[PDB]
Design a protein around this ligand. Structure first.
Ligand SMILES: CCOc1ccc2nc(S(N)(=O)=O)sc2c1
Ligand SMILES: [Zn+2]
Length: 259
């Protein structure tokens, strides 16, 4: 650890040295890493991957949201959970965050058939374990975001909050909203891809069971641009927050499955 981990854009936009992704420490150099490209036609249908059950997702809350220096993060604090989805237990929701760029064809961490989307949103959950860490301790639900002309009203509380947290270490409270406000219609979340991998920022622990839903969130171009326009990586506000994206990792001998 010769310097703090960063994304490539930060290294390229500032003279202050930092460890770019290919140099990350932790478990970040192991072989069951994320994100990946998904060849959709090569992922086999597994019949055990049934629908999700979301709890606390429809409930209107006033969430705390913060700039942690690499993303914007909603604190979910077990106020929501999931089950089904071929998952082996209920998982409690801890936090939601995003990765993005400022061009529509990049911004997502995962790619589907070699296409990146404009953002990727991650909802991070923790396994409810029995008595005797595992490869599926954490369940991250990934939603791809497609750029368009449709104003997503569901996202407005979040997007408005961004102006209040431009620098790292800053928190604000969002206007009343639910998690379902931010997602596609529930009936469109029956199609998803599933594989085992890692966390995409250090320490990149190989303990994530990934879900990438097929159906994108639609967000207006300028609601997407609001992220890079209002947020910074640093207190000095020299680097606008964008391209907070880990490059693609090799699948190796892992298999990807779908519903
Ligand atoms: C302090 C909590 O620790 C971490 C560390 C890395 C990390 N990556 C993700 S992501 N990008 O969803 O795969 S959630 C997460 C949480
Ligand atoms: Zn993430």
């Amino acid at each position: 650890a010769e310097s703090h981990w960063c994304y490539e854009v930060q290294a390229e936009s500032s003279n202050y040295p930092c460890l770019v992704p290919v140099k990350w420490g932790g478990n970040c150099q192991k072989d069951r890493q994320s994100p990946i490209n998904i060849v959709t036609t090569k992922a086999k249908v597994d019949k055990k991957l049934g629908r999700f059950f979301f709890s606390g997702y429809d409930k209107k809350q006033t969430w705390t949201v913060q700039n942690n220096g690499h993303s914007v993060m909603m604190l979910l604090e077990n106020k929501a959970s999931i089950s089904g989805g071929g998952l082996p237990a209920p998982y409690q929701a801890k936090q939601l965050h995003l990765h993005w760029s400022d061009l529509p064809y990049k911004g997502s961490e995962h790619s589907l058939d070699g296409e990146h989307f404009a953002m990727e949103m991650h909802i991070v959950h923790e396994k409810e374990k029995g008595t005797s860490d595992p490869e599926d301790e954490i369940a991250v639900l990934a939603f791809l975001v497609e750029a368009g002309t449709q104003v997503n009203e569901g996202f407005q509380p979040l997007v408005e909050a961004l102006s209040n947290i431009p620098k790292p270490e800053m928190s604000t409270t969002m206007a009343e909203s639910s998690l379902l406000d931010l997602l596609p219609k529930e009936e469109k979340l029956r199609h998803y891809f599933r594989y085992l991998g890692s966390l995409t920022t250090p320490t990149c622990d190989e303990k994530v069971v990934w879900t990438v839903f097929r159906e994108p969130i639609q967000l207006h171009r300028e609601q997407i641009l609001a992220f890079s326009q209002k947020l910074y990586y640093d207190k000095e506000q020299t680097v606008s927050m964008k391209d907070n994206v880990r490059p693609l990792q090799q699948l190796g001998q892992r298999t990807v499955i779908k519903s």
